Design a protein around this ligand. Structure first.
Ligand code: CLA
Ligand code: CLA
Ligand code: CLA
Ligand code: CLA
Ligand code: CLA
Ligand code: CLA
Ligand code: CLA
Ligand SMILES: CCCCCCCCCCCCCCCCCC(=O)OC[C@H](CO[C@@H]1O[C@H](CO)[C@H](O)[C@H](O)[C@H]1O)OC(=O)CCCCCCCCCCCCCCCCC
Ligand SMILES: CCCCCCCCCCCCCCCC(=O)OC[C@H](COP(=O)(O)OC[C@@H](O)CO)OC(=O)CCCCCCCCCCCCCCC
Ligand SMILES: CC1=C(/C=C/C(C)=C\C=C\C(C)=C\C=C\C=C(C)/C=C/C=C(C)/C=C/C2=C(C)CCCC2(C)C)C(C)(C)CCC1
Ligand SMILES: CC1=C(C/C=C(\C)CCC[C@H](C)CCC[C@H](C)CCCC(C)C)C(=O)c2ccccc2C1=O
Ligand code: SF4
Lengths: 160, 80, 160, 34, 742, 142, 87
């Protein structure tokens, strides 16, 4: 796909694993083998070897630079590069957008609506932050019932 | 020089005259508000154009309105 | 006790400081060729030209581009005379713009005291006309005499 | 180069004389009272 | 008449005023209605004069704010001693400091940032610090990290004491207005009690603790076997083996045989050849002298014991024929206005911090300060930026005194009234000398760039072309080098090594200091410095002088300090305010201080900092290119801004890569500043109106109306990002380059 | 209302001199003279910059701009209970009385003055500039 | 300080540094300068020959200059510098 070799069989990706441990191994040569800063570089090497063995096992595509490239078209092999964490993101981002929208409706029908935005009512906030879990069923539910959008006759419009 | 225009939305609150630093505005009698007075700009040739009257006008949108036109030595604010 | 307002008037933008109304300074400034209000303005314009003509040979022969050759007298004097001819045209177009032919004098007639004096003829269309020719003849002779005293007679000086 | 001396003529006129022609004639023109 | 006026429980210690945010201002006490309320909440948070008209409660607010500031500084010092105690290699650096870099910050190994824990030496990984704390603790005689932990917990104790005193002097016993107006007693107890007894106590520390420990550190003694600081006080024979004058035991002090104290109280001068830092026998004689001199100067003013000076009597007797009724009412200025005293104190503290910067690169007070070039560049650069910010703030609070505390009835025909009466002359002659300096320094740079571009190296201002040698500086440097022989006898050496007395001090194979040459390049860049300081003075003094009124706006004092403009009238009255002059003087402080630290970095990387090999040869970092390349802007862009930036951009993949990240993010904050500086409020307000329409469409309109930032606030945000981004750019470039080549 | 005549015999406040005073615009174009009656010898802030001792009787102050007369005039109308008037003096000798025109300040309404520069419509009923192309009239003056 | 009899003295129209001396030279020096600077008087006449005379005097020494007088008429005196890629 797109002229990119897989990273498990890429010679450039294995070259970057070789020259990263060798950079960290030469950093280890000036420390005692049981010393505290040498345990951090030894944990860095095992973090590096975990990283390169994770990138090759996920079917990542590596170019001529030896670097893993993401295919965001919507490929059946490449769902976890953009499509799977994008749907994970939009669920979380729609959770932020739904509990901030539902908080403003809950404080617009209050005695002092502007004091509830500088001082956020946490019992009112936390009872709808739980309610933002099921938000695609509540956003399209408000879209189908007409409560999501406001009619243009009740919207402040600058003159022509 | 500058053209200061008063519109019929004025409530006669007088604060456009009080904010005027070159004595352009004055309050004339009128029949279109509770205060029974509207502003006017007879000495509009003395207008610097600072729009302090527009900053002090509480009417939305503004009743006093200053249009920056031809600028002379009155409206440039010079002493030399 | 030392600082006074300008002619006793506190609301004119000036002060009678020692740098302005000294016994020595107000004697000096009143004899300089620019403040002679009864001398004909071609004659006093020759002195304004002789002065500025002379002084300008110095920074043009000692600092100019041809300062390290044997032509440093010829290069810097014609460069000093070139600034005379430009400033003569700057004096020419100033008198064309500021003063119109047949107008009055844009000059203060009253002196420091309450005595009435004649109008200064320099701020006229014909007074600045003869002043411009006074600067041209005086400036070209002030350059040439400073060139004669430096690179013809070659008088001994520490820097030349 | 065909004529080497027209560099030595036109660059002083269009570089020094012509701005001194144009700016002095404009300064007369922009300060005419009319 | 000087005595303690306090009163008990002015305000009750309650959290009900914490809940209401805008309690201090009457406009902000109604609650928010727009998003500009949040910005005026922070803008008017510290402005205590805009809260109340009573100077007594203002002075109590300022006193408890001083205590909160002291608590914050003691928390900061507690952190920096705790970082020395736990997260540093201070014992490893103290064993041998010529090979191990000072480091006191360990990062957590989380996201790849563990590469920032670099090889600083001594079997330690961490961020190499440039704050100079290690050399400061070596000069303090600190040998172990237990002493650093004790100083950290003691500073935490003092931070709790400052918090308790800030609560106490606002809620339990707060002083009245005449207590703060006893300025004679305050000067008597700041000169004698604070600066005199502080210098005397630090002199006692530098007699008993700093001096013998630092003498043992010059002998190569291991700090784990050096005796502890109280052992010199207890076993005075141990103190006497290092200095025999201690064997007499305080009898030459009271019998005036002070020359018998010549073993440990000396006027040597110069640097320690072992360490590269000033002598502590000189720093202890220095502190004993400025203590026996600040305690003398603290007995000058009249409090309540009869003897002394009323300073109103000092001022009102100082009147001259060129002024008339001068100096009268200035006591009433400086005791009824906090901003006037703040202007004077900020000018002295900023100028003093600039004095500190020069008197630390030139006379390095701490052992191995000079040879650690990162510390020297960072300390000079930090103190120049703090000093420039404080002198711009001095002009700021001068202008706030004019717009809000200057009473014209009490000031007739004094110095201030006459300075306002001829402010056109001051600003016009300052304008002339600024334009003259701008041509005669920067156009000289442009001339050098032009003739170097046109292939005329002889037509330049070089040391080989037309010379412009600073004969006054080159004479004052010879006067300060040839001083010990005749004008200052009792000196063993000279004040600084940068004067011309020889003494090529080599510490660890790296140059501490040597004679600094001054040539045509130094003349040009010092005239740049004088020009930029003068222009900063021009905007700032114009804002101070035209804060009341102008020829343009004669009622400018009624408009206030933080007003944007009068309007588009009189041709346009944009940035007429005194605040906007502080705003522009902040840019001119950036320009001034940035060229100062650029001249510093290039001048000492080219003529001071370097290495010494065998047979006395000195190889600098950028060898000898300040005399030929720092006369053109292309050399400044090329041999300084391009050649020395070849370690901030290829630091990626190393421990200095956070300097590359903050170099680029500092460019980001600077280009982000240009969004706020170049734009204006009404565009952003209508763009926010379109965004508010999109929010109204989806019913997510906030009741707090979204507004664009104010014009004063937009200029403030732009100058804050401009200073933050540009200063962080220079910080990142400096701290990558001089760490990399140091 | 008969306009007051400039006496040209009342003296000036005691002022040490300022550089913010009359430049050459006073000499060739106009300058402004403000005259007011004082209760006693006070000290006021000069609108050109500085402080002057104002007299116990009538005072005369020469100013360069009309804004300097209102900035002074509103200063001695709020801080002091002093009625003021100013003039416009031309270099030929003509003194033009300027404020207050009816004798009563323009904040207070008088029946003698008339409405000028007053539009009977609002801003939203002003005409578009596309239908007023190439005319001396504009969107607000009709 | 307002007078209504002398409008110039109450507005700043003062000859602050002027002098009312009629003459201080002699007749021999005065007749020499007006004779020589008599063809330089009129502004329209002086602007004509300064432009036309100034254009000729910069084109003369621009063209009669030598190699040592000006480097642009000297020309190259060495081999030309070849650029990269054989250009
Ligand atoms: C309370 C939640 C809420 C909701 C549901 C949305 C939703 C909306 N906003 Mg956003 N916005 C909000 C908060 C919110 N905003 C706040 C707090 C700010 C100030 C930073 C803005 C500033 C703003 C701008 C500048 C823009 C939008 C626009 C948009 C639209 C597209 C989303 C977008 O551009 O990314 C979100 C945009 C951001 C700048 C991020 C702010 C979101 C914060 C982090 C949420 C905070 C909520 C929490 C309870 C407090 C959509 C109508 C765009 C528009 O006009 O409509 C098409 C647009 O131009 N908004
Ligand atoms: C707009 C077109 C254009 C431009 C950019 C220039 C640019 C240049 N010319 Mg010019 N040149 C032009 C038109 C142009 N030329 C044409 C059409 C002719 C043919 C008759 C010439 C003949 C010419 C000569 C003979 C010389 C130059 C030279 C030069 C240089 C110095 C300027 C000067 O002395 O002007 C002199 C200009 C003229 C003699 C005629 C200019 C007429 C143009 C069209 C006026 C355009 C006005 C413009 C539209 C307004 C904006 C400069 C590189 C000198 C040179 O080579 O330097 C080393 C020189 O010796 N020019
Ligand atoms: C295209 C524009 C133009 C051209 C042709 C020149 C030409 C020249 N420049 Mg100049 N310059 C210009 C633009 C111009 N400049 C501008 C824009 C800048 C400002 C950044 C400068 C700044 C600059 C400075 C600072 C100096 C030069 C100097 C020089 C001279 C260098 C050659 C030499 O060694 O002569 C050596 C000198 C001579 C041979 C002296 C000749 C002087 C003649 C005789 C003047 C005669 C009268 C004159 C023609 C009247 C003009 C009338 C009007 C219609 C133009 C030469 C006369 C140097 C110089 O010596 O100036 C004279 C010098 O000091 N230039
Ligand atoms: C001899 C007594 C003396 C001494 C030592 C000081 C010392 C100090 N004063 Mg104080 N002061 C005094 C008496 C004294 N004052 C008098 C008599 C007046 C009344 C007229 C004032 C009124 C005054 C005000 C209004 C303010 C100060 C402030 C300051 C501080 C300077 C700011 C700073 O950062 O310094 C360096 C700071 C330190 C070194 C911290 C030291 C703190 C310790 C606990 C000592 C302070 C307690 C006390 C003053 C002396 C106790 C001595 C003790 C060690 C035995 C400092 C704590 C300023 C401040 O910050 O307010 C809090 C402030 O503006 N002073
Ligand atoms: C505020 C600072 C300060 C303080 C607390 C000390 C504290 C001490 N000094 Mg002193 N001393 C100081 C300043 C100080 N000194 C300075 C600056 C000098 C130079 C004149 C010395 C030189 C000195 C000598 C020569 C000796 C002391 C000694 C003493 C001790 C007994 C005197 C006493 O406590 O009273 C005591 C540990 C004696 C001692 O026990 O030495 C440790 C002793 O013989 N002092
Ligand atoms: C001894 C120090 C000192 C003193 C006592 C004060 C005191 C005061 N200043 Mg200031 N001033 C000083 C020095 C000082 N300043 C300096 C250093 C400058 C130059 C910048 C000025 C310039 C000055 C002006 C221009 C004005 C004042 C004003 C104020 C007043 C209130 C400001 C406020 O509410 O805080 C508000 C605090 C903030 C908005 C915090 C923002 C902090 C900066 C700007 C940005 C963050 C910087 C940070 C290091 C970067 C971190 C980035 C990171 C978070 C990502 C108060 C009287 C204002 C006033 O009205 O006076 C009466 C005002 O108009 N100051
Ligand atoms: C490189 C950018 C640059 C340059 C050229 C200028 C130029 C100027 N600034 Mg500065 N300044 C800048 C950026 C710039 N500024 C920015 C970032 C700000 C916004 C905050 C300011 C805002 C500003 C303030 C607020 C002030 C200045 C002032 C000045 C003047 C200083 C006096 C001087 O040097 O005269 C010499 C002129 C120059 C060096 C410009 C180059 C001219 C060359 C050398 C002449 C040769 C060209 C030739 C004639 C062409 C033919 C000068 C005109 C001050 C002023 O006007 O009073 C002195 C003033 O108070 N600056
Ligand atoms: C030590 C740090 C804690 C100091 C708290 C001091 C103080 O505000 O409490 C002293 C407060 C003063 O009580 C105040 O009374 C007011 C009515 O007069 C309001 O009710 C305020 O909310 C309440 O704080 O006493 C309390 O009731 C304690 C509760 C608030 C303290 C919470 C600490 C967290
Ligand atoms: C720095 C020194 C500049 C010399 C200035 C100096 O010697 O001051 C001399 C002079 C002193 O005046 P008096 O004799 O009135 O001073 C008595 C003092 O006690 C001030 O109250 O000060 C001025 O008049 C200021 C003039 C500044 C002139 C512009 C200088 C810039
Ligand atoms: C988190 C987050 C994020 C991210 C962010 C980004 C995007 C970034 C940006 C950024 C950039 C792109 C840049 C920046 C820069 C930075 C800086 C720049 C800072 C600084 C700070 C500080 C604090 C400083 C300091 C200092 C000073 C003050 C002085 C001296 C110098 C120094 C540096 C030291 C997002 C949104 C995604 C999401 C949400 C969350
Ligand atoms: C961008 C810009 C604005 C608009 C700036 C705004 C609206 C400030 C934006 C501040 C933040 C980003 C919005 C408030 C954030 C809230 C705290 C909500 C949190 C949401 C996330 C930040 C978590 C101006 O108002 C302005 C005024 C004058 C000159 C230039 C400019 C200018 O350049
Ligand atoms: S401020 Fe506005 S509303 Fe008030 S009187 Fe003037 S024009 Fe009318």
């Amino acid at each position: 796909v797109a002229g990119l070799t897989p990273c498990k069989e890429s010679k450039g990706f294995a070259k970057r694993q070789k020259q990263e441990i060798k950079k960290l191994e030469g950093r280890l040569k000036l420390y005692a083998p049981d010393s505290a800063p040498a345990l951090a570089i030894n944990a860095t090497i095992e973090k590096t070897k975990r990283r390169f063995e994770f990138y090759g096992n996920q079917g990542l595509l590596c170019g001529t630079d030896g670097l893993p490239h993401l295919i965001v078209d919507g490929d059946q092999a490449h769902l976890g590069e953009f499509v799977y964490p994008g749907l994970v993101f939009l669920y979380i981002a729609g959770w932020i957008g739904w509990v901030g929208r539902a908080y403003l409706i809950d404080v617009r029908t209050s005695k002092k609506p502007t004091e509830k935005e500088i001082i956020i009512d946490v019992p009112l906030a936390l009872r709808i932050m739980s309610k933002g879990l099921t938000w695609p069923v509540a956003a399209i539910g408000e879209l189908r019932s007409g409560k999501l959008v406001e009619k243009s006759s009740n919207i402040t419009v600058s003159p022509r | 020089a500058h053209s200061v225009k008063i519109y019929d939305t004025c409530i006669g609150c007088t604060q456009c005259v009080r904010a005027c630093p070159t004595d352009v505005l004055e309050m004339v009698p009128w029949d279109g508000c509770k205060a029974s007075q509207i502003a006017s700009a007879p000495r509009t040739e003395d207008c610097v154009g600072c729009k302090r009257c527009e900053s002090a006008c509480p009417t939305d949108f503004l009743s006093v309105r200053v249009y920056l036109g031809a600028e002379t030595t009155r409206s440039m604010g010079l002493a030399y | 006790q030392v600082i006074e307002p300008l002619n006793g008037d506190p609301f004119i933008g000036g002060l009678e400081t020692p740098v302005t109304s000294s016994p020595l300074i107000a004697w000096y400034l009143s004899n300089l060729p620019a403040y002679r209000t009864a001398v004909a303005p071609l004659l006093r314009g020759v002195e304004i030209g002789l002065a500025h003509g002379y002084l300008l040979v110095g920074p043009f022969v000692l600092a100019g581009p041809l300062r390290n050759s044997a032509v440093r007298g010829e290069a810097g004097s014609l460069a000093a005379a070139g600034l005379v001819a430009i400033l003569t045209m700057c004096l020419t177009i100033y008198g064309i713009a500021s003063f119109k032919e047949g107008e009055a004098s844009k000059a203060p007639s009253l002196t420091l005291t309450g005595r009435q004096k004649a109008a200064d003829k320099l701020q006229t269309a014909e007074g600045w006309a003869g002043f411009t020719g006074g600067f041209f003849f005086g400036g070209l002779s002030g350059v040439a005499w400073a060139y004669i005293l430096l690179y013809v007679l070659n008088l001994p000086y520490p820097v030349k | 180069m065909t004529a080497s001396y027209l560099p030595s003529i036109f660059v002083p006129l269009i570089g020094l004389v012509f701005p001194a022609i144009t700016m002095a004639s404009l300064f007369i023109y922009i300060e005419q009272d009319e | 008449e000087v005595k303690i006026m306090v009163e008990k429980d002015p305000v009750k210690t309650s959290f009900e005023k914490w809940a209401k945010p805008g309690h201090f201002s009457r406009t902000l006490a109604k609650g928010p209605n727009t998003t500009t309320w949040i910005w005026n909440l922070h803008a008017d948070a510290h402005d205590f004069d805009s809260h109340t008209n009573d100077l007594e409660e203002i002075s109590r607010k300022v006193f408890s704010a001083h205590f909160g500031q002291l608590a914050v500084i003691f928390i900061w010092l507690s952190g920096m001693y705790f970082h020395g105690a736990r997260f540093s290699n201070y014992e490893a650096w103290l064993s041998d400091p010529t090979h191990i870099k000072p480091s006191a910050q360990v990062v957590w190994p989380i996201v790849g940032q563990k590469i920032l824990n670099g090889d600083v030496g001594g079997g330690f990984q961490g961020i190499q610090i440039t704050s100079g704390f290690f050399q400061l603790w070596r000069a303090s005689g600190i040998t172990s990290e237990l002493q650093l932990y004790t100083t950290a917990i003691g500073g935490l104790i003092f931070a709790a004491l400052m918090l308790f005193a800030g609560w106490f002097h606002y809620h339990k016993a707060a002083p009245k207005l005449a207590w703060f107006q006893n300025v004679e007693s305050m000067l008597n107890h700041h000169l004698a009690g604070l600066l005199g007894l502080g210098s005397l106590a630090w002199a006692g520390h530098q007699v008993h603790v700093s001096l013998p420990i630092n003498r043992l550190l010059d002998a190569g003694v291991d700090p784990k076997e050096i005796p502890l600081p109280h052992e010199f006080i207890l076993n005075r024979d141990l103190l006497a083996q290092l200095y025999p004058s201690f064997s007499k035991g305080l009898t030459p002090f009271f019998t005036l045989n002070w020359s018998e104290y010549s073993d440990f109280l000396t006027f040597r001068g110069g640097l320690n050849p072992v360490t590269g830092g000033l002598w502590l026998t000189d720093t202890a004689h220095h502190h004993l002298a400025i203590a026996v001199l600040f305690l003398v100067a603290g007995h000058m003013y009249r409090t309540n014991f009869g003897i002394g000076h009323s300073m109103k009597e000092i001022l009102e007797a100082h009147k001259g024929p060129f002024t008339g009724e001068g100096h009268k009412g200035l006591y009433e200025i400086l005791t009824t206005s906090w901003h006037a005293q703040l202007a004077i104190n900020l000018a002295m503290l900023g100028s003093l911090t600039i004095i500190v910067a020069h008197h630390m690169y030139a006379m390095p007070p701490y052992p191995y300060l000079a040879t650690d070039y990162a510390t020297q560049l960072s300390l000079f650069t930090h103190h120049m930026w703090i000093g420039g910010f404080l002198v711009v703030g001095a002009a700021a609070h001068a202008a706030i005194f004019m717009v809000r505390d200057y009473d014209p009835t009490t000031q007739y025909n004094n110095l201030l009234d006459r300075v306002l009466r001829h402010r056109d002359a001051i600003i016009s002659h300052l304008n002339w000398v600024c334009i003259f300096l701008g041509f005669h320094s920067f156009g000289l740079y442009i001339h050098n760039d032009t003739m170097s571009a046109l292939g005329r190296p002889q037509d330049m201002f070089s040391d080989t072309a037309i010379q412009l040698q600073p004969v006054f500086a080159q004479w004052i440097q010879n006067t300060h080098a040839l001083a010990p022989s005749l004008t200052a006898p009792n000196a063993t050496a000279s004040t600084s090594l940068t004067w011309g007395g020889g003494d090529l001090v080599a510490v660890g194979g790296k140059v501490a200091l040597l004679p600094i040459p001054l040539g045509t390049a130094d003349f040009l860049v010092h005239h740049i410095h004088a020009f930029t300081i003068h222009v900063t003075v021009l905007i700032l003094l114009k804002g101070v002088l035209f804060a009341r009124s102008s020829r343009l706006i004669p009622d400018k004092a009624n408009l206030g300090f933080r007003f944007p403009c009068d309007g588009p009238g009189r041709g346009g009255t944009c940035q007429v305010s005194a605040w906007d002059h502080v705003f522009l003087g902040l840019f001119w402080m950036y320009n001034a201080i940035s060229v100062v630290i650029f001249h510093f970095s290039w001048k000492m990387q080219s003529d001071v900092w370097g290495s010494i090999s065998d047979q006395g040869v000195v190889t600098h970092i950028t060898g000898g290119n300040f005399a030929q390349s720092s006369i053109t802007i292309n050399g400044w862009l090329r041999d300084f801004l391009w050649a020395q930036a070849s370690q901030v951009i290829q630091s990626y993949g190393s421990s200095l890569s956070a300097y590359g990240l903050l170099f680029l993010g500092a460019h980001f904050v600077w280009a982000f500043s240009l969004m706020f500086l170049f734009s204006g409020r009404g565009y952003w307000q209508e763009l926010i109106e379109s965004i508010v329409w999109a929010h109204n469409k989806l019913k997510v309109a906030p009741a707090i109306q979204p507004r664009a930032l104010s014009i004063v606030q937009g200029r403030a945000v732009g100058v804050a990002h401009y200073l933050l981004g540009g200063i962080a750019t220079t910080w990142a470039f400096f701290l990558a380059r001089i760490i990399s080549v140091g | 209302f008969t306009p007051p005549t400039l006496n040209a015999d009342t003296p000036a406040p005691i002022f040490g001199g300022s550089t913010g005073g009359l430049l050459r615009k006073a000499q060739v174009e106009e300058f402004y003279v403000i005259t007011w009656e004082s209760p006693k010898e006070q000290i006021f802030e000069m609108p050109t910059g500085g402080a002057a001792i104002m007299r116990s009787g009538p005072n005369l102050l020469k100013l360069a701009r009309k804004e300097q007369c209102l900035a002074l005039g509103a200063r001695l109308r709020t801080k002091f209970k002093i009625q003021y008037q100013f003039y416009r003096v031309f270099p030929n000798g003509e003194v033009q009385y300027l404020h207050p025109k009816d004798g009563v300040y323009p904040e207070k309404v008088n029946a003698g003055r008339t409405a000028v520069g007053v539009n009977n419509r609002s801003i939203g009923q002003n005409a578009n500039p596309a239908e007023l192309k190439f005319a001396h009239k504009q969107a607000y003056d009709l | 300080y307002f007078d209504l009899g002398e409008i110039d003295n109450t507005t700043g129209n003062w000859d602050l540094y002027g002098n009312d001396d009629p003459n201080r030279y002699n007749g021999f020096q005065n007749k020499f300068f007006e004779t020589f600077a008599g063809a330089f008087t009129k502004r329209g006449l002086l602007l004509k020959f300064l432009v036309l005379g100034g254009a000729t005097t910069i084109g003369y020494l621009g063209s009669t200059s030598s190699g040592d007088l000006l480097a642009i008429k000297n020309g190259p005196k060495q081999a030309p510098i070849m650029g990269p890629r054989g250009r």
